[PDB]
């Protein structure tokens, strides 16, 4: 159907089918065990952020790789259940639609993860070249295949060069995995999210150290954002002033999975609505905090 010009927030990244099993004790190899509870969930960073944007009242779209099959059918039906526009999905002829398997041991809270395989090709710069950008007001890219994503980012800048300031597409990038190839992405986007895990891997012991240490790597005018779980979040823009928001932990923490993606989607949402960096930071912390007291994303708004 018809999508009004400059109305959608696009999230480019991974969609994964997560099979989560809760067990009394971790299984011994070669054995068959009955779990306490089993759950299928749509995962992936860009994919979770789309869920959150839809629930916040934002028209949103997901761009990522899928292969036809029963995994994709479940994932597409889940995206639709969450009101996510799925028209920009890069359908593949080869590889598996990603699926992960999590075993959570109830006697100690330990999680054993069997990560998806790497058979599915990522969204390429040539796949992105074929996308009409006019329907998007904001494009969020989850860092994965960095050298291809740089070309996608250069395409958006080129688009923006011919647009008046009110038709200019806002851009955000997330550097969540501690992989060297991704650090080139710091130099792209209006808003750069760097994870606590990436920061710690670079030897930074706080969000402040992380923002001050990495601000020299962002493009002129960009805002660098770093969430540090229950220590809240920080942002640093061109004025050199470090901004901070404390976390808003729930009375009882129920489920933290996708709290970081909730934060990213909420920050993007708040910025797209014309709110200040300080306001977006606080809003991001509030919604991530509310999510932590909830199973899944139902009731975050």
Ligand X SMILES: C[C@H]1CCN1c1nc(N2C[C@@H]3[C@@H](CC(=O)O)[C@@H]3C2)cc(C(F)(F)F)n1
Judged by CB under 6 A, does residue 204 bind ligand X?
no
Judged by CB under 8 A, does residue 209 bind its own copies?
no
Was 261 annotated as part of a binding site? yes
* Contact set for its own copies, span 8-27 (CB under 8 A): 19, 21, 23, 26-27
Closest approach, Cβ 30 to its own copies, in A, equals 5
Was 229 annotated as part of a binding site? yes
- The answer for residues whose C-beta is within 8 angstroms of residue 86's C-beta and 6 or more apart is 61, 62, 76, 79, 80
Was 142 annotated as part of a binding site? no
Burial of 87 (C-beta count, 10 Å sphere; 0-12/13-18/19+): exposed
Residue 256 neighbours by CB distance under 10 Å: 14
Residue 102 neighbours by CB distance under 10 Å: 18
Residue with tokens 């949103």: 60
Was 44 annotated as part of a binding site? yes
Residue 292 interacting entry, from ligand X, its own copies, none, C-beta within 5 to 8 Å by type? ligand X
Among 75, 232, 270, 277, binds ligand X (CB under 6 A): 232
Q: Are 249 and 292 contacting, i.e. CB atoms less than 8 angstroms apart? A: yes
Among 105, 249, 255, 294, binds ligand X (CB under 6 A): 249
Residue 26 interacting entry, from its own copies, ligand X, none, C-beta within 5 to 8 Å by type? its own copies
Distance CA 76, CA 190 (A): 30
Judged by CB under 6 A, does residue 194 bind ligand X?
no
Was 45 annotated as part of a binding site? yes
Judged by CB under 6 A, does residue 33 bind ligand X?
no
In sequence order, the β-bridge partners of residue 63 are 12
- The answer for residues whose C-beta is within 8 angstroms of residue 81's C-beta and 6 or more apart is none
Judged by CB under 8 A, does residue 254 bind its own copies?
no
Distance CA 262, CA 285 (A): 9
In order of 40, 60, 141, the CA distances from 50 in angstroms are 18, 6, 12
Among 169, 226, 292, 300, binds ligand X (CB under 6 A): 292
Residue 38 interacting entry, from its own copies, ligand X, none, C-beta within 5 to 8 Å by type? its own copies
- The DSSP string of 66-97 is E-SSHHHHHHHHHHHHTT-B-TT-EE-SSSPP
Closest approach, Cβ 110 to its own copies, in A, equals 5
- The answer for residues whose C-beta is within 8 angstroms of residue 207's C-beta and 6 or more apart is 196, 199, 226, 227, 228, 231, 232, 233, 234, 244
Taking CB under 6 A as the binding criterion, the range among 117-125, 143-151, 235-243, 283-291 that sits at the site for ligand X is 283-291
Query: Mask of contacts with ligand X, 109-128, x by CB under 6 A?
Result: --x-----------------
* Contact set for its own copies, span 70-89 (CB under 8 A): 70-71, 73-74, 77
- The DSSP string of 235-268 is EE-TT--EEEE-----SS----TTHHHHHHHHHH
Was 299 annotated as part of a binding site? no
Annotated binding site for ATP: 111, 229-232, 258-261
Annotated binding site: 18, 44-45, 48, 111, 229-232, 258-261
Instruction: List residues near ligand X by CB under 6 A.
Output: 111, 227, 229-230, 232-233, 247-249, 253, 256-260, 263, 285, 288-289, 292
Instruction: List residues near its own copies by CB under 8 A.
Output: 19, 21, 23, 26-40, 70-71, 73-74, 77, 96, 99-101, 103, 105, 110-119
């Amino acid at each position: 159907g018809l999508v009004p010009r400059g109305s959608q927030i696009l999230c480019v990244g991974l969609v994964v089918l997560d099979v989560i099993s809760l067990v009394d004790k971790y299984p011994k190899e070669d054995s068959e065990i009955r779990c306490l509870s089993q759950r299928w969930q749509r995962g992936g960073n860009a994919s979770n952020s789309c869920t959150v944007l839809s629930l916040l009242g934002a028209p949103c779209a997901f761009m990522g790789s899928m292969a036809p099959g029963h995994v994709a059918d479940f994932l597409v039906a889940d995206f639709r259940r969450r009101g996510v526009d799925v028209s920009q999905v890069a359908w593949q002829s080869k590889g598996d639609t990603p699926s992960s398997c999590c075993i959570i041991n109830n006697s100690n809270g330990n999680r054993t993860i069997v990560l998806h395989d790497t058979s599915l090709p990522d969204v390429s710069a040539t796949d992105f070249e074929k996308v009409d950008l006019t329907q998007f007001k904001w494009i969020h890219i989850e860092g994965r295949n960095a050298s291809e994503q740089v070309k996608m980012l250069q395409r958006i800048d080129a688009h923006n060069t011919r647009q008046p300031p009110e038709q200019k597409i806002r851009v955000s990038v997330e550097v969540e995995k501690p992989r060297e190839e991704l650090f080139q992405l710091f130099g792209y986007g209006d808003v750069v999210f760097v994870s606590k895990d990436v920061a710690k891997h670079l030897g930074f012991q706080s969000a402040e150290e992380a923002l001050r240490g990495l601000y020299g790597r962002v493009r002129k005018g960009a805002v660098l954002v770093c969430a540090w779980a229950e220590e809240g979040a920080d942002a640093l823009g061109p004025d050199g002033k470090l901004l901070h928001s404390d976390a808003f932990p729930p009375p009882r923490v129920v489920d933290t999975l996708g709290a970081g993606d909730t934060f990213n989607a909420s920050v993007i949402f708040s910025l797209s609505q014309g709110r200040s960096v300080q306001e977006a930071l606080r809003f991001g912390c509030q919604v991530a905090g509310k999510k932590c007291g909830l199973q899944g994303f139902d009731g975050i708004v």
